[PDB]
Amino acid sequence: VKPNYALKFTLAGHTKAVSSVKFSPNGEWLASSSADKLIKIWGAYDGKFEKTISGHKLGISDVAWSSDSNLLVSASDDKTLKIWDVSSGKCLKTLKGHSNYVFCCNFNPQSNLIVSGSFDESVRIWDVKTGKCLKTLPAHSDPVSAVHFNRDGSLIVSSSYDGLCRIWDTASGQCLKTLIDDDNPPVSFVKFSPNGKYILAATLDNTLKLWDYSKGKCLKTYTGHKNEKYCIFANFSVTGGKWIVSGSEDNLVYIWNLQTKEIVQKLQGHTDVVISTACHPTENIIASAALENDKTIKLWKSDC
């Protein structure tokens, strides 16, 4: 019916605003990135600080895991991405080519490829083994806010402050579809649904939308939260009830019934904008993270 997410752990350690949290595919770890130029790794179930991963010259906006949970990629204002070995903490590769801040990144399912999005308005596809850039997509006419592969990696979805969502064929780099929502507020976040059929997109008019990709139709709208300023991550929660999860500029974590669009729970505790949320792959566990006047991560757990 409704979840009952309760605070389990508050994770302190970052010296500046947190930018992104992501659970490892094996569910064992939480990774966090931050304006403090650091990646930190935490136990997903006990909240225990594990290690700090350092090397970027400026703040980090996004981090992402490889399928086997062995690698991380981060996106930095220093114009690079870095591929990291999680167990050692060593930088395996530095991905150079973007001409402005790198803002978002993701591995494909196979994890032989990384996709990046930058303020340079481009989307780049990188070879994980070599670190060389395979393709540069002239994707948008403003900063790229998010990039995400579908469930088999055959497609890429991107979003930009230009007001557009675009779907790209990974193999060729050609554009398959542009989603033009009549009236084009900046699109601050986008990702595929777990089944690859839909796309969840956030726009900077306090609105989340679920689109049918094949048909190009908006099926669901989620409102009631605050989002006009920051690129806040949104999630599909699939482990218990089927929810949509997002942070909010009113310091709250919002949870909606995916189907009914009704707010089912609001998570109170953070003392600044909740910029990032992640949903655990197997357990009813949420991780949330907040900006400059908070700087902490919170782990929450529900019965459904």
Partner: peptide
Amino acid sequence: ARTKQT
């Protein structure tokens, strides 16, 4: 970075 409005 993402942590600052732009």
